[PDB]
Ligand SMILES: Nc1ncnc2c1ncn2[C@@H]1O[C@H](COP(=O)(O)OP(=O)(O)OP(=O)(O)O)[C@@H](O)[C@H]1O
Ligand SMILES: Nc1ncnc2c1ncn2[C@@H]1O[C@H](COP(=O)(O)OP(=O)(O)OP(=O)(O)O)[C@@H](O)[C@H]1O
Ligand SMILES: [Mg+2]
């Protein structure tokens with residue numbers, strides 16, 4: 237139904253940044269300040285073609301590669317009636333929701349660097365509580381988050 | 393320890409092709425006959441950078457996209473002592489070996505076309521029998537077949 | 549175009565609740581495959597079906613006639629429908645966090661015919677038995693209590709499925725009829741029922 | 749230079765069995781994590797190590813002091829190591845497919861104190877109890893029995909596991925000592941035992 241918040245930890249030029257959102261978001265600012273690093277945090281979360289390559293050394297804060305990259309997004313879900321996109325989320329998730337917290341949802345991303353194979357694996361999660369986030373089920377190259385969201389990236 | 397067989401079904405110009413193998417294989421033939429489609433069947437099975445893009449419409453036999461692409465590799469595994477590579481395989485697998493069939497192994501690849509998302513998802517399996525092939529476990533972009541084999545592709 | 553294609557035009561173009569009282573044979577399976585193919589062709593949205601049979605080889609033949617799809621449709625038995633879509637994800641949600649998640653379906657050893665005693669067996673002994681009387685179901689009454697207690701299970705059933713295809717309705721108890729009337733009346737789900745009356 | 753660097757070259761660059769006559773606590777955790785990071789630094793092959801503790805607070809404290817490892821190193825308690833490494837992948841290969849794969853440890857109801865009634869309640873009721881004698885281990889006896897039975901379990905723990913780091917050996921049963929001696933004598937796994945000066 238509605239986006240609420242995004243918390244970005246240990247990414248490129250964000251140490252620990254919490255941004256309240258809505259639908260229809262507009263970001264602005266100076267040059268070399270990180271407007272396009274905000275939009276790649278949504279591409280690594282909700283798009284699979286960016287997520288399939290993993291993380292390099294340069295995706296970490298001040299090239300550290302000993303901190304964990306974590307990107308968490310919050311959905312509102314307070315309107316089950318009259319909205320179809322709430323049913324589009326609820327029909328795929330099926331088991332991570334709780335009746336005590338039926339009007340909040342969380343989609344998270346964790347990444348810890350290997351430093352032997354030189355690779356950052358990306359593990360996605362959902363849930364309705366910030367503790368006990370189970371992993372997203374999936375078979376092959378497709379998980380169940382790809383059945384819900386479609387990301388159209390436009391850049392001239 | 394030793395390669396034994398590869399069975400390629402419903403791939404690009406192989407309908408049902410069974411090839412006995414060994415270590416040090418040399419393939420030869422004419423022009424446009426399927427020598428490098430044999431090596432792409434080994435790249436889709438054992439290399440992750442080819443496998444992460446999935447299958448297209450043109451990877452199916454005669455553009456059909458109603459059959460299942462199945463590529464099965466057989467390993468011999470008869471020398472558990474004195475060979476380090478058998479220990480390298482056996483220390484990762486852990487749960488699909490059987491003591492009655494401890495001197496054969498199978499790594500299989502299956503793919504069925506979606507024809508709504510226009511995508512062929514690749515599901516990998518292993519086992520010690522040709523029936524009861526369980527899925528290879530994995531978290532994120534990494535499964536347990538990538539912990540064993542490293543594929544070096546040389547082409548000038 | 550006579551009575552067969554007239555009944556086909558009455559059974560395809562009507563999208564309401566359909567009650568079929570057919571005879572022995574005469575193609576219930578091919579009219580089920582054609583009704584399922586017409587409903588999957590007509591629906592543009594994300595919604596899904598649940599083909600419910602009583603024998604799994606007929607559902608396997610229905611899935612072989614249909615094919616492979618990514619809309620998440622369920623084809624199977626009634627016991628697999630209740631065991632996968634109802635009991636196992638929401639048994640911790642309905643009966644509290646102290647009740648276990650996973651279980652093994654074995655209704656051949658326990659023959660207790662009490663409700664709170666059956667809840668104490670599924671709490672303590674971690675098995676799912678059945679009632680001693682063959683006219684009552686512990687499992688379908690457990691599914692009715694899960695859809696009565698939990699809010700998330702009603703939202704998942706109303707969001708996921710839009711038409712439940714029931715085959716062989718005549719060998720069903722009153723608990724299955726009460727659960728399907730609870731799915732039809734309160735959750736506004738269109739229901740599809742075929743079967744032949746009497747005929748042993 | 750001199751005897752301090754010579755003693756550090758003796759106590760760091762060992763490769764055999766280690767048995768240190770040291771007391772419980774008093775900075776043994778720091779030299780244990782220094783030995784663990786020296787063994788992870790000195791190894792270049794595909795082998796992996798194991799760490800066995802009792803409590804979960806020392807397990808998460810050790811997991812905080814290491815951090816992240818991608819070599820498949822296991823750090824945990826003894827029951828979790830036996831359950832997730834010996835029992836669950838090999839019960840179907842040792843005792844057939846009649847025994848269940850997933851299982852939970854619930855010893856608050858069954859107080860059965862024999863092996864034969866324990867194996868028939870894993871056969872029938874599919875749950876495990878505890879002995880009336882508190883100096884018993886049913887799970888370690890089952891792990892020793894299916895390590896004696898299965899060939900591929902011996903092949904996996906010969907191929908993967910290299911060393912086992914044992915903490916709090918002062919309160920242990922003889923069945924755990926028998927299983928660790930069975931891992932020591934045949935399948936060639938070194939042992940790291942801390943202990944007590946006297947009693948305590
Ligand atoms: N891994 C990293 N660690 C630290 N700093 C980084 C990292 N990656 C990028 N940066 C910094 O972030 C900035 C990247 O600029 P970016 O393209 O995000 O700016 P912008 O706001 O989108 O600019 P413009 O509006 O001009 O297009 C630089 O200052 C660069 O030094
Ligand atoms: N999807 C497909 N359906 C049908 N035929 C296909 C398909 N994909 C490839 N082919 C056929 O397979 C052949 C591909 O040639 P390929 O490059 O594999 O041959 P080659 O033996 O390696 O050649 P060269 O000796 O010239 O290097 C062609 O004959 C092509 O028509
Ligand atoms: Mg920019």
Ligand SMILES: [Mg+2]
Pocket residue numbers: 427428
């Ligand atoms: Mg070629």
